[PDB]
Design a protein around this ligand. Sequence first.
Ligand SMILES: OC[C@H]1O[C@H](O[C@H]2[C@H](O)[C@@H](O)[C@@H](O)O[C@@H]2CO)[C@H](O)[C@@H](O)[C@@H]1O
Lengths: 5, 438
Amino acid sequence: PVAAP
Amino acid sequence: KIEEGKLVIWINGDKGYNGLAEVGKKFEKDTGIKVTVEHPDKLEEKFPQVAATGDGPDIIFWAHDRFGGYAQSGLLAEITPDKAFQDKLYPFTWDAVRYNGKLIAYPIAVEALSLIYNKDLLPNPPKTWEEIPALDKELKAKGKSALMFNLQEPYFTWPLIAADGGYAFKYENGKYDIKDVGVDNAGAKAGLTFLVDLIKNKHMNADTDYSIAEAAFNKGETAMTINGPWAWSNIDTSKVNYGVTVLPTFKGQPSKPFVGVLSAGINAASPNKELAKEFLENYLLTDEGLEAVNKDKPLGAVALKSYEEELAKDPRIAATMENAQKGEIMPNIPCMSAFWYAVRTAVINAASGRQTVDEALKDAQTAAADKCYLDELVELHRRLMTLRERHILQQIVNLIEETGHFHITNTTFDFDLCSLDKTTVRKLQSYLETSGTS
Ligand SMILES: OC[C@H]1O[C@H](O[C@H]2[C@H](O)[C@@H](O)[C@@H](O)O[C@@H]2CO)[C@H](O)[C@@H](O)[C@@H]1O
């Protein structure tokens, strides 16, 4: 799971 | 805990541990430091268990394939030889012990399996696997068999499987990846079917292991065996007039053994890192150090240039080099243990009738590739989650947007690496190698 701004 | 002021070394029971203990005694004579050489059973599995708790040997010897996994688990110390020392060994041996840009072991020797044959039973060894069934029939009429080799370890059977199958791995975007059809292809199925057919036709037995095959060849009961350089000592002692040569071809294709670089790593928990370095660089990796080990059990084509030039005229070493050049250098990535378990299970299952060859290799491929790919995604996730620079972040987001596999929250752009096609993941890795960021 990747979260980017 | 590991005892300070002494060296404990582990090396496999098939290697020259007595010759290595002689190098240890020379180190002891000069330095006063005692060196103990041990050969525990299943040491490649024992080492990650005891070293995880801060125990184990100061130095561990094994082929380079297992070291990447040990290094990823923080079990090895980074080695720091200077340029002068590095120039003493062949450059490709250093590449085998490099993991994530760092040297994690000292290379000792290049190993590859060869065909070993008894010249008094077979003056001319077969060039093909295809001619082995008729040759066995001819030898069975004289009280002998054509070939016996270890069927329990995939290291010994992989050369035949990969002859028409090709290499299992490829190097791409700065890492070794297992190919999508590296284990499951038509050539690999043809090779494993040939092996199973040798068993069904009573030319080989499914339960043949290392000791059984070694005892049969050394007692003159079988004309041929498949083994590495370490085995030559017991054959010399048995007085068999033997030859060491190229492995048989299958469908005209050379057999492709996995090539291992026998390497020495230093345990990260060792309080004797400096003594270990001195022992390995100044005592073992010298002509005299490698000769003491080599005279007990041959190492193969050693990594030290000066000593390799002295052993180059040995026809048995030229056969080792020939088979190594036709084979595949083992990757050192952490999923190598899962790849070996998968192939081991596939060969055992096919030989016993538990699975068909097709299903055995299909299952080996998914098990090895799922583990290798998951490790790659874990690393790519770690790498992506440290990026902060706007231009790089925008380009990764742009690549994900093209697929539509994302969701947005009040504060983040989210995506799961498992929901992407492998082509998108390769674009991410390819872009990351150009970004200048790691
Ligand atoms: O069979 C899988 C096994 O293959 C290799 O082990 C070799 C080793 O490299 C040789 O030095 C020799 O001792 O025989 C072994 C096969 O019994 C890999 O190095 C190993 O990790 C793997 O499990």
